[PDB]
Design a protein around this ligand. Structure first.
Ligand SMILES: Nc1cccc([C@@H](OCCN2CCCCC2)c2cc3nccc(C(=O)O)c3s2)c1
Ligand SMILES: [Mn+2]
Length: 297
């Protein structure tokens, strides 16, 4: 039985007036978006930040991901890439896998095949993900008035924009920098919520889409119950922070157990916001570059 795509999460296309600052905007859309857990925000057409990473020196060692590791119950993350060599590897993998040019593969087919492979015992597909790359190391994808890189006049607006993830409020009231993600086809992240039940905001700088699944916070405990019922007994009793490292689950399984799930394809230039305690997971459609930070209101 092929994967059944969840219903689409809300997409907002704010006018220039509505696009003034993310905190007020998110506060206004909250009555709807908090009921879907995730939402997508498309900035105004002419809002186009230039990519500000130091591409020359950008070197990283991605983590190895075996899609079917859970159903199955010795390759190591030793390959260093540049942005360019990782992209060459990623495009070659996808075009060879589907036997067509990377841009011609329908998003629905990568989605269907991802979930098939995750549960397949007969085919072992292994991919790589440049995840947990700190923006402190090679710079943010957004221009920043840091002095490490030069900002042109046309760039300054973006260095100062409230939608530059480096300008999000990250301190919590009591008595953090953006992270970068270099994706390839089928690279993925399991179901999780954020430390402190924080919001997260996610920007796809460039590349092929990032496919998301989200669960509203009112269903958080229902998801956690389904996860405990169906998780391997050896992982059933693990603390949430550790269990979240292996909480891979087909969205249709959650949907069959009454958990509301919403999906979206995040395209280049679009934001995805996750709300407090909104479980989310996803996978990349192909070579892409994302930036994400947690924030509190
Ligand atoms: N199962 C899994 C596999 C690979 C990475 C991750 C996790 O990364 C952890 C790296 N680092 C650790 C410290 C906290 C911040 C992240 C992510 C959370 C997340 N949430 C939203 C979107 C994305 C995205 O990949 O686009 C990601 S990836 C989870
Ligand atoms: Mn997250």
């Amino acid at each position: 039985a092929e994967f059944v795509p969840p219903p689409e999460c809300p997409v907002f296309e704010p006018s220039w007036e509505e696009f003034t600052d993310p905190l007020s905007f998110i506060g206004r859309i909250r009555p709807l978006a908090e009921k879907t857990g995730i939402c997508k925000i498309r900035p105004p057409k002419d809002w186009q930040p230039p990519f500000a990473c130091e591409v020359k020196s950008f070197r990283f060692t991605p983590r190895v991901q075996r899609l079917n590791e859970l159903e199955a119950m010795f390759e190591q993350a030793v390959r260093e890439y540049t942005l360019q060599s990782f992209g060459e590897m990623a495009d070659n993998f996808k075009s060879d896998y589907f036997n067509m040019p990377v841009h011609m593969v329908p998003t629905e087919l990568v989605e269907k095949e991802f979930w098939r492979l995750v549960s397949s015992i007969e085919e072992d597909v292994i991919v790589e993900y440049g995840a947990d790359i700190s923006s402190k190391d090679f710079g943010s994808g957004f221009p920043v008035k840091d002095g490490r890189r030069k900002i042109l006049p046309e760039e300054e607006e973006y260095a100062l924009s409230g939608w530059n993830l480096n300008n999000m409020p990250v301190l919590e009231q009591s008595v953090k920098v953006p992270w970068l993600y270099v994706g390839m086809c089928f690279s993925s992240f399991c179901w999780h919520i954020e430390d402190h039940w924080s919001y997260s905001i996610n920007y796809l700088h460039w590349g092929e889409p990032k496919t998301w699944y989200g669960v509203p916070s009112h269903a958080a405990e229902q998801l956690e119950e389904v996860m405990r019922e169906l998780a391997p007994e050896l992982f059933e009793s693990q603390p949430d922070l550790l269990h979240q490292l292996v909480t891979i689950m087909n969205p249709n399984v959650l949907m069959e157990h009454g958990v509301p799930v919403y999906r979206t394809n995040q395209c280049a230039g679009e934001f995805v916001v996750t709300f407090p305690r909104a479980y989310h997971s996803g996978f990349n459609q192909g070579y892409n570059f994302a930036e994400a930070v947690n924030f509190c209101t």
